Design an enzyme around this catalytic site. Structure first.
Site, PDB file in Angstrom:
ATOM      1  N   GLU A 173       1.280   4.549   0.589  1.00  0.00           N
ATOM      2  CA  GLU A 173       0.774   5.737   1.259  1.00  0.00           C
ATOM      3  C   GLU A 173       1.748   6.092   2.371  1.00  0.00           C
ATOM      4  O   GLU A 173       2.400   5.214   2.945  1.00  0.00           O
ATOM      5  CB  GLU A 173      -0.632   5.519   1.829  1.00  0.00           C
ATOM      6  CG  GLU A 173      -1.307   6.817   2.238  1.00  0.00           C
ATOM      7  CD  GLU A 173      -2.764   6.653   2.637  1.00  0.00           C
ATOM      8  OE1 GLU A 173      -3.216   5.515   2.855  1.00  0.00           O
ATOM      9  OE2 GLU A 173      -3.453   7.693   2.744  1.00  0.00           O
ATOM     10  N   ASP A 206       0.867  -1.181   0.000  1.00  0.00           N
ATOM     11  CA  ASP A 206       0.000   0.000   0.000  1.00  0.00           C
ATOM     12  C   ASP A 206       0.902   1.228   0.000  1.00  0.00           C
ATOM     13  O   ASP A 206       1.558   1.520   1.004  1.00  0.00           O
ATOM     14  CB  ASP A 206      -0.914  -0.043   1.221  1.00  0.00           C
ATOM     15  CG  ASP A 206      -1.901   1.086   1.269  1.00  0.00           C
ATOM     16  OD1 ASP A 206      -1.912   1.951   0.379  1.00  0.00           O
ATOM     17  OD2 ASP A 206      -2.700   1.098   2.230  1.00  0.00           O
TER      18      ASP A 206
END
Length: 434
Positions: A272, A270
């Protein structure tokens, strides 16, 4: 025009490297030789198990897979490939029989080679000459298995706060476990200054789960749930979409080591929370989907038996080829932002994609209703995703799971009767013990 290159792949999945989970006594497929040019009437070839190649393969991937018993693997027609001139291909049926006495929770290998091919066929290298099946016996771990080809669940736990044993709170009325795949969200990528390289960095809650995987994670795997380590950016120069080729190779090796050491089933990436990279560092590069794809590819190479999965967020997803290898081979599952369905790239199919993503803590993304389930079936989606359930919110969470199970599985999700507290293996009664 006379160079007719051949390579081998599994005919059903079209993958050169295919993980096979045995849920019954036999698994039937085809081995397919693909050709770059139309064959002539004399073109011919056979396939054989190539046990010697397993040593070469294990060395290339730094793996240690044992050979699946060859007596359990049979080919039709003596392994002779039937050429279809009109489809530039040749195929033969292969059956994998489940055997006795082979060790639990172990991946075995069937390396298959093209053999005795006619001289009009060119085989460029040993990679093209072979395909590989990575076989795991799951016959005793069927609680999460809801049938061949059904839609499957993908669930993230915020393990800072919630025990992943709460996977067991989610069952159909027939006892099957709803969530096929669960993610421990999340370990981090961070910069190691003393080493001058990125590393996997685990907060104390993640680390406690890994250290105690035998009591807090392995009970899920015994019942067929795949447990993945989530990786996430964490506010320094490193990130999952900004590693150079060398940085990605090194980081992929570390991720594979974590999955081996703690007996896990793969990873979610992910992209982020990372900051801008230091472009002077040879482990880093400009943030890009191309760098993210490189990391996914290198991770699959380091753990070919395990799942490499991504959240379609940031720059983590979108480039479909690395070193001539299509994303179908190195993205097993992609999940999308709440309110959207994921989409395939390259030669991936929608069976590798989520059709819904539900934020169980914050509320967005909709519900797994009967109508939504049928819509996802009609669209060919393979997965439904959920993020951050917690026992304190089970009323809301389970309300969003009404109706869908009857459509997907013929059995609705049951009301929960058990929950788990953080870091505690004790099954508490839901709701009385809250």
């Amino acid at each position: 025009i006379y160079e007719n290159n051949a390579y081998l792949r599994d005919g059903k999945s079209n993958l050169v490297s295919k993980v096979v989970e045995l849920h019954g006594e036999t698994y039937a497929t085809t081995v397919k030789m693909g050709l770059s040019k139309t064959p002539n009437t004399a073109t011919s070839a056979k396939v054989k198990i190539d046990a010697a190649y397993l040593e070469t393969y294990n060395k290339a991937h730094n793996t240690d897979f044992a050979l699946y018993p060859q007596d359990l693997v049979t080919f039709a027609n003596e392994g002779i490939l039937t050429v279809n001139a009109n489809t530039k291909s040749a195929e033969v049926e292969m059956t994998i029989r489940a055997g006795e006495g082979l060790q639990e929770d172990k991946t075995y290998a069937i390396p298959v080679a093209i053999s005795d091919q006619s001289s009009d066929i060119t085989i460029k290298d040993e990679d093209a000459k072979h395909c590989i099946y990575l076989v795991k016996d799951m016959r005793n771990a069927g609680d999460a298995y809801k049938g061949e080809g059904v839609m499957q669940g993908y669930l993230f736990f915020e393990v800072n706060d919630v025990n992943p044993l709460n996977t067991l709170s989610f069952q159909l009325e027939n006892g099957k476990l709803l969530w096929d795949v669960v993610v421990l969200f999340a370990a981090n990528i961070n910069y190691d200054a003393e080493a001058g390289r990125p590393r996997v960095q685990c907060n104390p809650n993640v680390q406690y789960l890994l250290d105690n995987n035998e009591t807090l994670l392995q009970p899920l795997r015994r019942r067929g749930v795949k447990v993945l380590l989530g990786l996430l950016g964490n506010h320094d120069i490193t990130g999952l979409a900004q590693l150079s080729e060398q940085g990605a190779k090194d980081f992929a090796r570390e991720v594979a080591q974590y999955c081996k050491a703690y007996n896990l089933d793969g990873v979610n990436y992910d992209d982020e929370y990372s900051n801008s990279p230091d472009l002077s560092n040879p482990s880093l590069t400009n943030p890009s989907t191309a760098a993210a794809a490189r990391l996914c590819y290198e991770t699959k190479q380091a753990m070919p038996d395990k799942l490499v999965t991504v959240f379609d967020w940031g720059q983590m997803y979108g480039v479909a080829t690395v070193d001539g290898v299509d994303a179908k081979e190195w993205i097993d599952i992609v999940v999308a932002n709440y309110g959207s369905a994921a989409y395939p790239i390259g030669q991936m199919t929608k069976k590798q994609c989520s059709g819904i993503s539900m934020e169980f803590n914050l509320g967005g993304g909709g519900s797994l209703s009967a109508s939504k389930a049928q819509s996802m079936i009609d669209g060919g989606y393979g997965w439904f995703m959920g993020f951050a359930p917690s026992p304190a919110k089970y009323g809301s969470v389970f309300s969003r799971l009404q109706g869908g199970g009857e459509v997907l599985y013929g059995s609705n999700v049951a009301a929960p009767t058990i929950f788990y507290k953080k870091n505690d293996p004790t099954p508490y009664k839901y709701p009385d013990d809250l």
